Amino acid sequence: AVEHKQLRPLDVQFALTVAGDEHPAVTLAAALLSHDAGEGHVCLPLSRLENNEASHPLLATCVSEIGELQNWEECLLASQAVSRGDEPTPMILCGDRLYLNRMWCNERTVARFFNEVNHAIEVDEALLAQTLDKLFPVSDEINWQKVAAAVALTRRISVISGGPGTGKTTTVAKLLAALIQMADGERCRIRLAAPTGKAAARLTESLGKALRQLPLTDEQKKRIPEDASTLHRLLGAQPGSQRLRHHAGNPLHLDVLVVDEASMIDLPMMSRLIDALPDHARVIFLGDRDQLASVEAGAVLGDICAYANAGFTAERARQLSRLTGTHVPAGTGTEAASLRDSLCLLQKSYRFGSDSGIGQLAAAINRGDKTAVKTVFQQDFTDIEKRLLQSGEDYIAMLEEALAGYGRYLDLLQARAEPDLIIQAFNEYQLLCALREGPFGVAGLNERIEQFMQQKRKIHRHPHSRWYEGRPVMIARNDSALGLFNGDIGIALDRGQGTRVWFAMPDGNIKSVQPSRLPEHETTWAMTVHKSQGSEFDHAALILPSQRTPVVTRELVYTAVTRARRRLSLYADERILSAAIATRTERRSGLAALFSS
DNA sequence: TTTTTTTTTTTTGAGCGACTGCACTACAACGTTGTAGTGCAGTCGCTCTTTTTT
After folding, report:
1. C-alpha torsion sign, points A136, A363, A303, A235
2. What residues bind ATP, as annotated?
3. Gap between the Cα atoms of A47 and A49, Å rounded
4. Core-most of A108, A375, A401, A436, by most CB within 10 Å?
5. Binding site feature residues of A
6. Is the CB of A417 under 7 A from strand B?
7. Angle value at C-alpha A296, between A337 and A257, nearest 5 degrees
8. Residue A163 CB in 7 A reach of strand B
9. Residue A107 in contact with residue A589, Cβ under 8 Å?
10. Which domains does chain A have, with CATH numbers?
11. Distance of CA A141 to CAs A50, A147, A256, A258, A348, Å?
């Protein structure tokens, strides 16, 4: 790539330190491996190192041995830095793919956890079918939520793959209800995990509004899951040291663990979660398959759910037909029956059907770009609009459409109404940008919107105060003492006691905080797509930069599409939208070979 | 090129020198038994200054 050629100094110093007095082939291989580890690739295939390097004949002229070191494997194994997996070496070459020792150890740990430990918990099928019939009222046709709950209560380790607006939390509530109704005398210490605190708060409020609906008992309401914790807080991560409280010796005393939003779980956090689990806990993973990749290097949920497209097993199809009492189709072939049985696919979305263009655009994002052009083209479904952004007049038109989007917010701001309706109107329209700085980014769009509110008589702003009435702020760091998390919006206004920032809590109330009490504050007229995950907006507007960047890809446009409830606007070129769909963010990892055997 | 969060302390004096208890033999009083000196081991006090120059 373009960034892969510009070598970081970390990779260069790693290549100069590890290889040192060895051949320059080992130096180039270590530099390429460190650059691919910095970009997020887990493994490095030797075919790309052999073919896509211009210095490969030069290093073929550099080595001088009896066998001349013609093969890359012999040239790497001749050095003391690469071994086959026996010597304590930094670089490991096992399956014609070179990795580091930590990445290889975590990949083998994940493969052992998802290949060997996942056994089948055999329970009574009649009572489970009765609870599934008494919980799900629909029994006329195939319901994917009932099959997901059955395959999550059947096996120990199960992954539930589903998009937003498909009723995932209702399925989790039905799964927990059938789990408690199945094991009556046996106690169940249900635990909930989340990667971020805002997603944990959303999970808590969702399961709170979901579990009070289903009829329970006095002992069943006592076993309701209390709260969802962060993965760094559940495992006990420290700021100074990386030592966990439940690292290897004492596992967490849990019966079932529901980890929501597994798409934001990287490989080291997954390996640290795996080593903390005992030999009897059942884990249920939640998240979307086509969602955005993890933050650090690694792709756990995508490489797990890639085998969900094959289908179930021949015995598992009959098992699901005996459990659900319906006709469950079988998957052709058998490669890994445990992982293909542990997976599930949610296709029936309840908040949007084929009449809405959002689901059709999300289905056409994973397909070719011409399908997305046809989805935007015919009649627009009264949901998706496309505005071309090339010059300054298109920028003025985009600012005018943002004024038309923020019209109700400014109308409720100028009328001096209650802040709850102001926040409810601000949470309906949202801009989503890719980069941070420049003309296309967070601080650029924020400063341009502030200058446009200074131009037209909509918002009065003092240049030296920095706390004018009506500015939207967002927090960047978590603060459990104030009750606000990362990614929460606040609106600064004057209620009569001074300029204070009102925040909308997920409990339904509003909290008025002093602006001096805010630890972090950044203007949020346009959010990034990575930082807007978990949230939901009624009217979203994507703004893509004209400069070609590897950030704008298929998963970014998919997360921008699924962020909108009803209305979505676009401000991008046609060539950028055509190139982002075809360029998929692939991450080379050894999970494709370890799960295949 | 995008981004995620985290709250738990822990330890630290030992060698020098005496006091007393237990054992063990040497030697004289009455082969055996009482008196005396020495050595080994557990336990306990103690103790590690002072200061000002452009």
Report:
1. negative
2. 162-169
3. 5
4. A375
5. 162-169
6. no
7. 50
8. no
9. yes
10. 1-100 (1.10.10.1020), 101-346 (3.40.50.300), 356-584 (no CATH)
11. 54, 12, 30, 28, 12
